[PDB]
């Protein structure tokens, strides 16, 4: 109950933490935390705003030690991908991880799929799927005034 | 003279003893249940964090539960009325009050204070001779191994 | 241990007989055959007969053959 | 790298796997449970319910019912009131 | 191969029963005679209570009664089923197919229901 | 008082028949025969566990299955026992498993 | 204190022995201390300047990490040794202008750019934005 | 609307009115399995209805997997007849359909974000836990799993009328969030 309440408090304060992030600090499993979260929402008769990719960008990029420009590029890429509906049904965390990978590979500070998955709580395979979904339109997703250390055409294909 | 280092070392030793105590308790519960334990979950960071912060903030030097026997006045708000006041506060010394002080009065300018403690600087009132200031070139040994 | 749970099993068998309803008393050797007590030593059986069967209040002795007392329990 | 997000803790999944593989203790027949109880009493005169449950490998409620049928709880001045496997 | 394994099993069995033959006080010639004979032998229904409204809703039960067909006896480590198929991690065991015997350590099986 | 799996096979049947012959001849007591069967079960279990180091595969269809007291009683049809060295075809098979 | 005493205290702390059968041994090996850092509500770490701490009523503290080796003896004749690198155990308030403060080795121009008086001697702690000095 | 949900699974409970021996049923039945360590009931399967039934020692049985109400009732009767053929006095008492599951497709992608924003009182969308949005209809007590692909799964219905009514209610709402 306490872990689910902590997750709900983060969501309500507007700095949501992933269920995996909460589980990492709580002895309770992610499944139990989610079940208690649903029950708490029903009991309180309240609601929490849907999470967006931009919610986790600051924390993920800071933990990856990426530049502010790379963080902005990743946030823009994720938001534009959601707007264009290139990742339907995909989890916001997965979309954010894929966008961060794209930005990191396009910038000097390059981070591996394993690294991004470790910080974001998302499997490298899921990151691969989301990145493959957003890769075809990478030039469209990237911000206009972005300094590509690696040209968008030569971004990793996978 | 117990400077910031040794005092913080005493506090940190106490808090680390505590930290290992809760680590033992948490791990023991899981071991008794037969399931392995997560080391990261076993650690309470607030022990060290809040202990150091509370000691330095309140000035009661010791565990917040043992404030009765915890030394007081060790930590004070830096005096910023003047630069000279700030320097004096940073070079201040505090004499003890207890059996030693009762048996021998430290409210006096002992000959040994030459070159070590300022002979003129001392508060007026109940603190005369108990609060002292280092001489300009006085240095306090930081300690090293005798090996 | 040895030679205690077997006695407990015999006494439980007597309760099972009484849930059956066979008022007629039965021979101890036949009870042993039914309960697979042949393996047990004979001397323990003799000690049971001499001491424990009489001590047990539920058990009764009629015409040299041991069985519960139909008078003790309410009918 | 500390507190990296994780769906479930390794110790928790290992313990859950052990529990699932072991499975809940089954309610065996009264005759077999009684025989096992009588065998245990032969080894030891006095048994605590917690260890007797481990020996019998039966549900606590079912074992308590069968043990209430025959054995009796004796209050002790040394440790605590415990079961007595002797029917009398 | 299988006969050689059988001979090794014979050796193990006789060695394992020697101690019992000493415990029971029986003479050792019994084991020799046993081995000799063993080798020789080897080589709108509103009122729904009545269920009779349906008939022939079963199959022939004589297969298990017969058991004459080929039979496999082994131990199972894992057996999983997903809505159509049965999967088999059967470990070391024995098989009796067409009289001839087969020996195995790991057996993997997939079947449909 | 053991696993008692291989008794209903060719080997166990031959052993049981031999014990029956000796019992008819009064050479061995039935308790001795039962002890021999128990020792045979132990030895055969150990022998199959240790001296067998070959893997087998098989496929087919299942017609019936049963489970009780940790005893599976599968009944398959048109089974193909495939091995790297040889392949065997069988119209029907009954797989009895225990653990 | 920071360089010698913390590490020596951790080393001198007896290894944790647990058993209740498998037995676990926990040993604390090495101390790591990062620069004073502040975490925003979103969870993004960022270096905490002393002026920022003073203005925002923060505590000028540095994260503290220990290397912890856990060895489990299962009684099965194999022992599993796993090392957790830089496990966070708390934060230590940092004396300003010390070797572990952000204003260490900075030129007067850098201090001015950071809005810190070059004449400020440091030697104190910022706890909840209050400059605390430890009296000898 | 032109679309009708099709049932994927029906759960029905029926009391046989007599105590049973699970071990005997496991030993004598054809497709039955009994693992008291795992579960306290006996799980049996019949292919021709293509359904699975759990039988308890209390005499109550649960039948699942039936795609139709008639199939569920017939399968329950068949299981009861099998138990009866095993010699028990099994009967068919208080047969009831406890829950029905239906599935369908709206044939267009859906914006679950807009749907949850509009119907937060009934909607629950947590991609972390489950990609499908859970909608709790009140007038029918039906839970709908709506997916971005357009697939909709309704559950909690006691009768097919509830499934159809719930889909009729939800379809106009979904049409307003067509992607």
Write out chain B in H/E/C secondary structure: CCCHHHHHHHHHHHHHHHHHHHHHHHHHHHHHHCCCCCHHHHCCHHHHHHHHHHHHHHCCECCHHHCCCCECCCEEECCCCCHHHHHHHHCEEECCCCHHHHHCCCCCCCHHHCCCECCCCCCCCCCCCCEEEECCCCCCCCCCCCC
Do F60 and F48 share a structural domain? no
Tell whether D1 is covered by a domain.
no
Contact residues on chain H for E49, CB-CB shorter than 8 A: 91-93
CB pairs under 8 A between E and H: 28
Provide the residue range defining the domain that includes F91: 54-99
Distance CA E104, CA E87 (A): 17
Do F91 and F71 share a structural domain? yes
3-state secondary structure of E19: helix
Alpha carbons within 13 angstroms on the beta-carbon side of residue C67 total: 18
Do F60 and F37 share a structural domain? no
Distance CA B50, CA G89 (A): 12
CB pairs under 8 A between B and D: 17
As for how many domains chain D has, the answer is 1
Which is it for the CA torsion H83, H87, H89, H91, positive or negative?
positive
| Token pair of E17 as six digits | 């029963």
Resolution in A: 4.5
Tell whether D62 is covered by a domain.
yes
What is the domain-level CATH number for residue F30? 1.10.287.190
| Token pair of D51 as six digits | 């260890």
Do B40 and D15 make contact, defined as CB atoms within 8 angstroms?
A: no
Method used to determine the 3D structure:
cryo-EM
Do F66 and F88 share a structural domain? yes
CA proximity to H73, closest of E53, E56, E59: E53
- D6 close to A (CB below 8 A): yes
- F81 close to E (CB below 8 A): yes
Residue B99 neighbours by CB under 8 Å, 6+ apart: none
Give Cα B131 to chain centroid, integer Å: 16
Do F70 and F49 share a structural domain? no
For residue H173, the surrounding DSSP H or E stretch is helix H160-175
Q: How many CB atoms lie within 10 A of CB H79?
A: 28
Q: Are E32 and F18 in contact (CB under 8 A)?
A: no
Do E51 and H45 make contact, defined as CB atoms within 8 angstroms?
A: no
Contact residues on chain D for G65, CB-CB shorter than 8 A: 2
For residue A89, the surrounding DSSP H or E stretch is none
User: Any idea which residue has 């079947």 for tokens?
Assistant: E111
As for how many domains chain F has, the answer is 2
User: Which chains neighbour C (Cβ–Cβ under 8 Å, 3 or more pairs)?
Assistant: D
Contact residues on chain F for H23, CB-CB shorter than 8 A: 68-69
| Token pair of G119 as six digits | 């004449």
Do at least 3 CB pairs under 8 Å connect H with A?
yes
**How far is residue A94 from each of residues A29, A57, A123, D8, G85, measured CA to CA in Å?**
20, 11, 9, 18, 27
> How is chain C split into domains, by residue range?
4-75
Residue B36 neighbours by CB under 8 Å, 6+ apart: B30, D10, D11, D14, D15, G72
Distance CA H14, CA H79 (A): 11
CA proximity to H132, closest of H147, H110, H152: H147
For the CA atoms of B107, B111, B114, B119, what is the dihedral angle to 10 degrees?
A: 30
Q: How many CB atoms lie within 10 A of CB B18?
A: 15
From first CA to last CA, the distance across chain G in angstroms is 14
Residue G53 neighbours by CB under 8 Å, 6+ apart: G36, G38, G59, G60, G126, G129
Distance CA D23, CA H36 (A): 9
User: Which chains neighbour F (Cβ–Cβ under 8 Å, 3 or more pairs)?
Assistant: E, H
Contact residues on chain G for A13, CB-CB shorter than 8 A: 41
Do F81 and F49 share a structural domain? no
User: Which chains neighbour A (Cβ–Cβ under 8 Å, 3 or more pairs)?
Assistant: B, D, G, H
- B56 close to G (CB below 8 A): yes
From first CA to last CA, the distance across chain C in angstroms is 38
Distance CA B59, CA B69 (A): 13
Mutate to test the interface with E, among H29, H32, H51, H77 (most CBs of E within 10 A): H77
Q: Are A109 and A65 in contact (CB under 8 A)?
A: yes
Provide the residue range defining the domain that includes D72: 22-84
User: Which DSSP symbol is given to A49?
Assistant: P
Tell whether D11 is covered by a domain.
no
Indicate the angle between helix axes F10-25 and E29-42, nearest 10 degrees.
130
Contact residues on chain A for D9, CB-CB shorter than 8 A: 23, 27, 29
CA proximity to A111, closest of A124, A92, A130, A129: A124
Alpha carbons within 13 angstroms on the beta-carbon side of residue H172 total: 4
Domains of chain H in start order, with CATH, are 1-11+98-179 (3.30.310.10), 12-97 (3.30.310.10)
Three-state secondary structure readout of chain C: CCCCHHHHHHHHHHHHHHHHCCCCCCCHHHHHHHHCCCCCCHHHHHHHHHHHHHHCCCEEEECCEEEECCCCCCC
Tell whether D2 is covered by a domain.
no
CA proximity to G101, closest of G133, G119, G126: G126
What is the domain-level CATH number for residue D34? 1.10.10.10
If you compute the radius of gyration of chain A from its CA atoms, what whole number of angstroms results?
A: 16
Residue H86 neighbours by CB under 8 Å, 6+ apart: H24, H25, H28, H29
Do F58 and F48 share a structural domain? no
Phi, psi of H73 (to 5 degrees): -65, -45
Alpha carbons within 13 angstroms on the beta-carbon side of residue B73 total: 11
Q: Are H110 and H178 in contact (CB under 8 A)?
A: yes
Q: Are H145 and H134 in contact (CB under 8 A)?
A: yes
């Amino acid at each position: 109950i306490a872990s689910a309440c902590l997750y709900i408090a983060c969501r309500q304060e507007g700095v949501p933490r992933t269920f995996k992030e909460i589980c990492a600090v709580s002895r309770i499993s992610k499944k139990e935390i989610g079940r208690c979260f649903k029950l708490i929402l029903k009991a309180l008769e309240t609601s929490v705003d849907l999470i967006t990719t931009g919610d986790f960008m600051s924390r993920f990029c800071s933990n990856l030690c990426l530049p502010k420009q790379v963080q902005m590029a990743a946030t823009h890429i994720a938001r534009k991908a959601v707007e264009l509906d290139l990742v339907p049904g995909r989890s916001p965390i997965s979309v954010a991880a894929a966008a961060i990978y794209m930005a990191s590979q396009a910038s000097a500070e390059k981070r591996t799929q394993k690294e991004i998955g470790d910080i974001a709580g998302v499997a490298d395979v899921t990151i691969r799927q989301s990145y493959r979904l957003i890769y075809p339109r990478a030039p469209d997703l990237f911000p206009t005034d972005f300094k590509f250390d690696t040209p968008v055409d030569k971004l990793p294909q996978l | 003279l117990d400077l910031a280092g040794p005092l913080l070392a005493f506090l940190f030793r106490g808090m680390f003893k505590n930290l290992l105590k809760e680590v033992r308790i948490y791990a023991q519960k899981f071991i008794d249940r037969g399931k392995d334990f997560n080391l990261e979950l076993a650690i309470k960071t607030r022990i060290i964090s809040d202990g150091l912060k509370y000691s330095l903030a309140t000035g009661n030097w010791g565990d917040q539960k043992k404030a009765h026997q915890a030394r007081a006045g060790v930590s004070q708000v830096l005096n910023r009325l003047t630069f000279a006041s700030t320097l004096s506060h940073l070079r201040r010394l505090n004499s003890p009050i207890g059996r030693d002080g009762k048996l021998a009065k430290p409210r006096q300018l002992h000959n040994t204070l030459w070159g070590m403690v300022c002979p003129a600087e001392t508060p007026e009132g109940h603190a005369v001779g108990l609060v002292k200031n280092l001489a300009l070139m006085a240095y306090i040994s930081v300690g090293s191994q005798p090996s | 241990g040895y030679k205690f749970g077997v006695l407990a099993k015999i006494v439980n068998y007597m309760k099972t007989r009484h849930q059956r309803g066979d008022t007629h008393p039965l021979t101890l050797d036949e009870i042993l055959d039914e309960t697979q007590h042949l393996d047990i030593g004979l001397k323990q059986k003799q000690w049971l007969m001499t001491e424990a069967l009489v001590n047990n209040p539920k058990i009764e002795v009629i015409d040299g053959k041991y069985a519960f007392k139909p008078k003790y329990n309410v009918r | 790298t500390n507190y990296k997000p994780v769906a479930n803790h390794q110790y928790n999944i290992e313990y859950e796997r052990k529990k699932k593989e072991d499975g809940k203790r089954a309610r065996a027949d009264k005759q077999h449970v009684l025989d096992m109880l009588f065998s245990a009493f032969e080894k030891h005169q006095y048994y605590n319910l917690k260890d007797l449950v481990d020996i019998t490998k039966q549900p606590v409620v079912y074992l308590k019912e069968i043990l209430k049928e025959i054995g009796v709880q004796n209050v002790k001045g040394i440790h605590k009131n415990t079961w007595e496997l002797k029917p009398e | 191969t299988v006969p050689k394994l059988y001979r090794s099993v014979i050796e193990d069995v006789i060695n394992d029963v020697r101690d019992i033959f000493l415990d029971d006080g029986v003479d050792e010639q019994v084991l020799m005679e046993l081995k000799t004979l063993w080798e020789n032998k080897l080589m709108g229904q509103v009122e729904e209570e009545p269920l009779n409204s349906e008939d022939d809703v079963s199959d022939e039960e004589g297969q298990e009664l017969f058991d004459t067909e080929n039979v496999v006896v082994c131990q199972y480590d894992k057996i999983h089923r997903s809505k159509n198929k049965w999967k088999f991690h059967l470990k070391d065991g024995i098989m009796n197919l067409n009289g001839r015997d087969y020996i195995f350590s790991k057996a993997i099986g997939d079947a449909e229901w | 008082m053991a696993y008692q799996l291989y008794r209903n096979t060719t080997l166990g049947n031959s052993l049981q028949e031999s014990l029956d012959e000796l019992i008819q001849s009064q050479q061995i007591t039935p308790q001795l025969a039962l002890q021999v069967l128990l020792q045979f079960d132990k030895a055969i279990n150990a022998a199959l566990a240790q001296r067998v180091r070959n893997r087998v595969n098989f496929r087919g269809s299942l017609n019936t299955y049963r489970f009780c007291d940790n005893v599976w009683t599968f009944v398959l049809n048109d089974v193909e026992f495939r091995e790297v060295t040889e392949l065997i075809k069988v119209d029907k098979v009954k797989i009895v498993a225990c653990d | 204190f920071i360089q010698m005493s913390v590490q020596r205290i951790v080393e001198d702390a007896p290894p944790i022995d647990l058993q209740a059968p498998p037995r676990y041994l926990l040993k604390f090996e090495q101390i790591y201390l990062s620069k004073p850092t502040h975490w925003e509500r979103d969870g993004a770490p960022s270096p905490m300047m002393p002026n920022e701490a003073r203005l925002r009523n923060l505590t000028y503290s540095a994260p503290l990490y220990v290397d912890i080796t856990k060895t489990v003896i299962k009684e099965g004749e194999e022992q599993l040794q796993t090392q957790h690198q830089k496990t966070f155990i708390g934060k230590i308030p940092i004396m300003l202008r010390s070797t572990y403060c952000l204003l260490n080795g900075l030129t007067d121009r850098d201090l001015c750019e950071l809005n810190e008086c070059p004449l400020d001697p440091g030697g104190y702690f910022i706890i909840n934005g209050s400059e605390k000095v430890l009296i000898a | 609307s032109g679309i009708v949900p099709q049932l994927q699974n029906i759960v029905s409970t029926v009391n046989l009115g007599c105590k049973l021996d699970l071990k005997t049923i496991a030993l004598r039945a054809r497709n039955a399995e009994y693992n008291p360590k795992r579960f306290a009931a006996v799980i049996m399967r019949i292919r021709e209805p293509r359904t699975t039934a759990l039988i308890f020692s209390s005499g109550k049985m649960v039948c699942t997997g039936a795609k139709s109400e008639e199939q569920s009732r017939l399968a329950a009767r068949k299981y009861a007849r099998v138990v009866q053929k095993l010699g028990f006095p099994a009967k068919f008492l208080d047969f009831k359909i406890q829950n029905m599951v239906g599935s369908c497709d709206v044939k267009f992608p859906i914006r679950l974000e807009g749907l949850v924003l509009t119907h937060q009182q009934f909607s629950s969308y947590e991609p972390e836990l489950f990609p499908g949005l859970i909608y709790r209809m009140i007038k029918p007590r039906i839970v709908l799993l709506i997916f971005v692909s357009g697939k909709v799964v309704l559950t909690g219905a006691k009768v097919r009328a509830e499934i159809y009514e719930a889909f009729e209610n939800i379809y106009p709402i979904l049409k307003g969030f067509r992607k």
